Amino acid sequence: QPCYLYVIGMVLTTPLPDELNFRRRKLYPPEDTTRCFGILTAKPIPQIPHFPVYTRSGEVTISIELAASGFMLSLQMLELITRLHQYIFSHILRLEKYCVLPLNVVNSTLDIDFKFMEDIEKSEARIGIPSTKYTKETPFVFKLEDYQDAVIIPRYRNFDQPHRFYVADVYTDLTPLSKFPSPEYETFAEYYKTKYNLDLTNLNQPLLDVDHTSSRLNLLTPRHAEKRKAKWESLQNKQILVPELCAIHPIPASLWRKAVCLPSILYRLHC
RNA sequence: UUGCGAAUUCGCUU
RNA sequence: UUGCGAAUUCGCUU
């Protein structure tokens, strides 16, 4: 059966304006990273007009364009594409339900990203918290570049259902020896040692700012006892995390952002 | 424009 | 050997 390959093109046509940026976030135009999502089908998709999704960075125009058609794909790659499609909806978006898949340029030409897919399948941070053994002779090593476009997960808690945070900022002027925001602890180091019996091998690493990854499923409209949830969500966002204590997720942050738009788009397309 | 957990008071059936 | 709904007080993050 011949295939049709469609790109879910994405542009931030209207950036979030000041009076709407209450949380004072950075703006993230999806068109600043080449990797993105597309749709694979056994039957073509009728020409649908441009429609908006409303994101934290503002108004993103969605566009479904045909990449290729009438081609064949090996059963092997189809099994790969399908496994990925399932991965994004159950493990990445945590939902319950032809094929959605990542695309990326080859060197202007956009194509199915099989390498990136095999990477995800090979990651030991694809599903849960991985086991990493830092000692004095093999201390945690900080690579600033690995934290430029990342989603992270605390290795030390929430084993059942791990949290995922966007790295919002890297604070080069802080260390695990920096003063703790709460008085009962002098330092982050002491805090993680006192509370979680955690020891650090690297006392010179910058600390990380974080932003929660969760969002509502429907973004077709702008976001413009519940008090207890607001206080909690606020402290969640104000958390400062130690890089050594977190695992980096194989899905980069700029693609994680595009992925949370997907239910809004599939739902729109099929209605 | 996003949480689970524990108490407590109360509405809803014939 | 089986419920949903509304208030309220509180614990859990850094």
Coordinates of C-alpha atoms (C1' of nucleotides) in Angstrom, one line a residue:
Chain A
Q1 CA 0.0 0.0 0.0
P2 CA 1.4 3.4 -1.1
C3 CA 2.0 6.1 1.4
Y4 CA 1.3 9.8 1.8
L5 CA 3.6 11.9 4.0
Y6 CA 2.4 15.2 5.4
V7 CA 4.2 17.9 7.4
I8 CA 2.5 19.5 10.4
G9 CA 4.1 22.9 9.7
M10 CA 4.2 25.4 12.6
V11 CA 4.8 29.2 12.9
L12 CA 4.4 31.5 15.8
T13 CA 2.6 34.1 13.8
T14 CA 1.6 36.1 16.9
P15 CA 3.9 36.1 19.9
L16 CA 2.5 36.5 23.3
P17 CA 2.2 40.2 24.1
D18 CA 3.5 41.6 27.4
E19 CA 0.2 42.1 29.1
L20 CA -0.5 38.4 28.6
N21 CA 2.9 37.0 29.7
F22 CA 1.9 36.8 33.4
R23 CA 4.5 34.2 34.2
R24 CA 7.2 36.2 32.4
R25 CA 8.3 33.3 30.2
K26 CA 10.8 33.2 27.3
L27 CA 9.0 32.9 23.9
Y28 CA 9.7 29.8 21.9
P29 CA 8.9 30.0 18.1
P30 CA 8.6 26.4 16.8
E31 CA 10.0 27.4 13.5
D32 CA 13.4 27.9 15.2
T33 CA 14.1 24.2 15.3
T34 CA 14.0 22.0 12.2
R35 CA 12.9 18.8 13.9
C36 CA 9.1 18.6 13.9
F37 CA 6.2 16.2 13.5
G38 CA 4.4 14.9 10.4
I39 CA 1.6 12.5 9.5
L40 CA 1.8 9.2 7.5
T41 CA -1.3 7.9 5.8
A42 CA -2.7 5.2 3.5
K43 CA -5.2 7.7 2.1
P44 CA -4.8 11.4 1.3
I45 CA -5.9 14.3 3.5
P46 CA -8.3 16.9 2.2
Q47 CA -6.8 20.5 1.9
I48 CA -7.7 22.1 5.3
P49 CA -7.2 25.8 5.9
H50 CA -4.7 27.3 8.3
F51 CA -5.9 27.2 12.0
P52 CA -4.5 28.5 15.3
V53 CA -3.3 26.7 18.3
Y54 CA -2.8 28.8 21.5
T55 CA 0.5 28.0 23.2
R56 CA 2.5 29.5 26.1
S57 CA 4.6 31.3 23.5
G58 CA 1.4 32.7 21.9
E59 CA -0.5 32.1 18.6
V60 CA 0.8 29.3 16.4
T61 CA -0.7 28.8 12.9
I62 CA -1.0 25.1 12.0
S63 CA -0.5 24.0 8.4
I64 CA -0.8 20.5 6.9
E65 CA 1.3 20.3 3.7
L66 CA 2.0 17.3 1.5
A67 CA 5.7 16.2 1.5
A68 CA 5.6 13.0 -0.6
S69 CA 3.1 10.5 -2.0
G70 CA 2.9 7.2 -3.7
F71 CA 5.9 5.7 -2.1
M72 CA 6.5 2.4 -0.3
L73 CA 7.9 1.7 3.1
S74 CA 9.5 -1.5 4.4
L75 CA 7.5 -3.4 7.1
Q76 CA 10.5 -2.8 9.4
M77 CA 10.3 1.0 9.3
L78 CA 6.5 0.8 9.6
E79 CA 6.9 -1.2 12.8
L80 CA 9.3 1.5 14.0
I81 CA 7.0 4.4 13.0
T82 CA 4.0 2.8 14.8
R83 CA 6.0 2.1 18.0
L84 CA 7.0 5.7 18.1
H85 CA 3.5 6.9 17.5
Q86 CA 2.4 5.0 20.5
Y87 CA 5.3 6.2 22.6
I88 CA 4.4 9.9 22.2
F89 CA 0.7 9.4 23.2
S90 CA 1.1 7.1 26.2
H91 CA 4.6 7.9 27.6
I92 CA 5.1 11.5 26.5
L93 CA 1.6 12.9 26.6
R94 CA 0.2 10.2 28.9
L95 CA -3.2 9.7 27.2
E96 CA -5.4 6.7 26.3
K97 CA -6.6 6.0 22.7
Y98 CA -2.9 6.9 10.9
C99 CA 0.6 7.5 12.2
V100 CA 2.3 10.5 13.7
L101 CA 6.1 10.7 13.4
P102 CA 9.1 13.1 13.7
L103 CA 10.5 14.9 10.7
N104 CA 13.8 16.6 10.3
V105 CA 15.9 18.1 7.5
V106 CA 18.5 15.9 5.9
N107 CA 21.1 18.6 5.2
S108 CA 15.9 22.2 2.9
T109 CA 14.5 18.7 2.4
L110 CA 12.4 17.4 5.3
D111 CA 12.3 13.6 6.0
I112 CA 11.3 10.9 8.4
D113 CA 13.8 10.9 11.3
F114 CA 14.7 7.2 11.7
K115 CA 18.0 7.9 13.5
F116 CA 16.2 10.0 16.1
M117 CA 13.6 7.2 16.5
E118 CA 16.2 4.5 17.1
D119 CA 17.8 6.8 19.6
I120 CA 14.6 7.0 21.6
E121 CA 14.3 3.2 21.6
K122 CA 17.9 3.0 22.8
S123 CA 17.6 5.5 25.6
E124 CA 17.4 4.3 29.2
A125 CA 15.5 7.5 30.0
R126 CA 12.8 6.7 27.4
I127 CA 10.4 5.3 30.0
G128 CA 11.6 5.9 33.5
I129 CA 14.3 7.1 35.8
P130 CA 17.7 5.5 34.8
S131 CA 20.3 4.2 37.2
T132 CA 23.5 6.3 37.2
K133 CA 26.5 5.6 39.3
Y134 CA 28.5 8.7 40.2
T135 CA 31.5 8.3 42.5
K136 CA 34.6 10.3 43.4
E137 CA 36.6 8.8 40.6
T138 CA 33.7 9.2 38.2
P139 CA 32.0 12.4 39.3
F140 CA 29.0 13.8 37.5
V141 CA 30.2 15.9 34.6
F142 CA 28.3 19.1 33.6
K143 CA 27.9 19.8 29.9
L144 CA 26.2 23.1 29.4
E145 CA 25.2 22.1 25.9
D146 CA 23.3 19.1 27.1
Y147 CA 21.0 21.4 29.0
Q148 CA 20.2 24.0 26.3
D149 CA 17.1 22.3 24.9
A150 CA 16.2 19.7 27.5
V151 CA 13.5 18.2 29.6
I152 CA 14.5 16.7 32.9
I153 CA 13.3 14.4 35.5
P154 CA 14.2 14.1 39.2
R155 CA 15.9 10.7 39.7
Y156 CA 15.3 10.8 43.5
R157 CA 11.5 11.0 43.7
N158 CA 8.1 10.1 42.1
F159 CA 9.4 6.7 40.9
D160 CA 5.8 5.6 40.1
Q161 CA 5.0 8.6 37.9
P162 CA 8.1 10.7 37.2
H163 CA 7.8 14.5 36.8
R164 CA 9.1 16.2 33.6
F165 CA 10.3 19.8 33.6
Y166 CA 11.5 22.1 30.9
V167 CA 14.9 23.5 31.8
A168 CA 13.9 27.1 31.8
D169 CA 17.2 28.6 32.9
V170 CA 20.8 27.6 33.8
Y171 CA 22.1 29.6 36.8
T172 CA 25.8 29.6 36.3
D173 CA 26.2 31.8 39.4
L174 CA 24.7 29.2 41.8
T175 CA 26.2 25.9 43.1
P176 CA 24.9 23.1 45.4
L177 CA 26.8 25.1 48.0
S178 CA 24.6 28.2 47.4
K179 CA 22.3 29.3 50.2
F180 CA 19.0 27.4 50.6
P181 CA 15.7 29.4 50.1
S182 CA 14.4 27.8 53.2
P183 CA 16.0 28.6 56.6
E184 CA 16.1 25.0 58.1
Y185 CA 18.8 24.2 55.6
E186 CA 22.0 26.2 54.8
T187 CA 22.7 24.7 51.4
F188 CA 21.1 22.7 48.6
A189 CA 23.8 20.1 49.3
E190 CA 22.8 19.8 52.9
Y191 CA 19.1 19.8 52.0
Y192 CA 19.4 16.8 49.6
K193 CA 21.7 15.0 52.2
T194 CA 19.4 15.7 55.1
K195 CA 16.1 14.9 53.3
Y196 CA 17.0 12.3 50.7
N197 CA 20.3 11.0 52.0
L198 CA 21.8 12.2 48.7
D199 CA 25.5 12.8 48.2
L200 CA 27.0 15.1 45.5
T201 CA 30.2 14.3 43.5
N202 CA 30.2 17.7 41.8
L203 CA 30.0 20.9 43.9
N204 CA 30.7 23.4 41.1
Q205 CA 27.7 22.7 38.8
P206 CA 25.3 25.6 38.0
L207 CA 21.7 25.0 39.2
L208 CA 18.6 24.8 37.0
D209 CA 15.4 26.8 36.7
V210 CA 12.3 24.7 35.7
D211 CA 9.0 25.0 34.1
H212 CA 6.3 22.3 34.3
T213 CA 5.6 20.5 31.0
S214 CA 1.9 19.5 31.6
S215 CA -0.9 21.3 29.7
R216 CA -4.6 21.1 28.9
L217 CA -5.4 18.9 25.9
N218 CA -7.4 21.5 24.0
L219 CA -5.5 24.6 22.8
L220 CA -8.0 25.7 20.0
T221 CA -9.0 28.5 22.3
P222 CA -6.7 31.0 24.1
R223 CA -6.2 30.7 27.9
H224 CA -7.3 34.4 28.3
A225 CA -10.0 25.0 47.3
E226 CA -8.5 25.7 43.8
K227 CA -6.3 28.2 45.8
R228 CA -4.3 25.3 47.2
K229 CA -3.5 24.0 43.7
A230 CA -2.3 27.5 42.7
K231 CA 0.1 27.8 45.6
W232 CA 1.5 24.3 44.9
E233 CA 1.8 25.0 41.1
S234 CA 3.6 28.2 42.0
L235 CA 6.2 26.6 44.2
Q236 CA 6.6 23.9 41.5
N237 CA 7.7 26.6 39.1
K238 CA 10.0 28.3 41.6
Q239 CA 11.9 25.1 42.3
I240 CA 15.7 25.1 41.6
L241 CA 17.1 21.7 40.7
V242 CA 20.5 20.1 40.8
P243 CA 21.6 18.8 37.4
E244 CA 23.4 15.8 39.0
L245 CA 20.1 14.7 40.5
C246 CA 18.1 14.7 37.3
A247 CA 18.1 12.6 34.1
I248 CA 17.8 14.3 30.7
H249 CA 14.9 13.0 28.6
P250 CA 15.7 11.8 25.0
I251 CA 12.9 14.1 23.7
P252 CA 14.3 17.6 23.4
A253 CA 12.3 20.4 24.9
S254 CA 11.5 22.3 21.6
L255 CA 10.0 19.1 20.2
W256 CA 8.2 18.3 23.5
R257 CA 6.5 21.7 23.0
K258 CA 5.4 20.8 19.5
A259 CA 4.1 17.4 20.7
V260 CA 1.6 18.9 23.3
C261 CA -0.1 20.6 20.3
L262 CA -0.8 17.3 18.7
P263 CA -4.1 16.3 20.3
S264 CA -5.5 19.8 19.4
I265 CA -4.4 19.2 15.8
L266 CA -5.6 15.5 15.3
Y267 CA -8.9 16.4 16.9
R268 CA -9.3 19.4 14.6
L269 CA -8.3 17.5 11.5
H270 CA -10.8 14.7 12.1
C271 CA -13.8 16.9 13.0
Chain B
rU1 C1' -5.3 28.8 32.2
rU2 C1' -1.3 22.0 35.4
rG3 C1' -1.6 18.0 41.0
rC4 C1' -2.7 13.3 45.3
rG5 C1' -3.2 12.5 49.8
rA6 C1' -5.8 12.9 54.7
rA7 C1' -9.4 14.5 58.0
rU8 C1' -14.3 17.3 58.7
rU9 C1' -19.4 19.4 57.7
rC10 C1' -23.2 19.0 54.3
rG11 C1' -26.7 18.1 49.7
rC12 C1' -28.8 14.3 46.5
rU13 C1' -32.5 8.0 46.7
rU14 C1' -37.8 5.8 49.2
Chain C
rU1 C1' -17.7 -6.2 51.9
rU2 C1' -21.3 -0.8 46.3
rG3 C1' -21.8 5.9 45.2
rC4 C1' -21.1 12.0 43.0
rG5 C1' -21.5 16.3 44.3
rA6 C1' -20.3 20.9 47.2
rA7 C1' -17.8 23.7 50.9
rU8 C1' -13.8 23.7 54.8
rU9 C1' -8.9 22.6 57.5
rC10 C1' -4.4 20.3 56.6
rG11 C1' 0.2 17.2 54.8
rC12 C1' 3.5 16.5 50.6
rU13 C1' 8.0 20.0 46.1
rU14 C1' 12.8 24.0 46.4

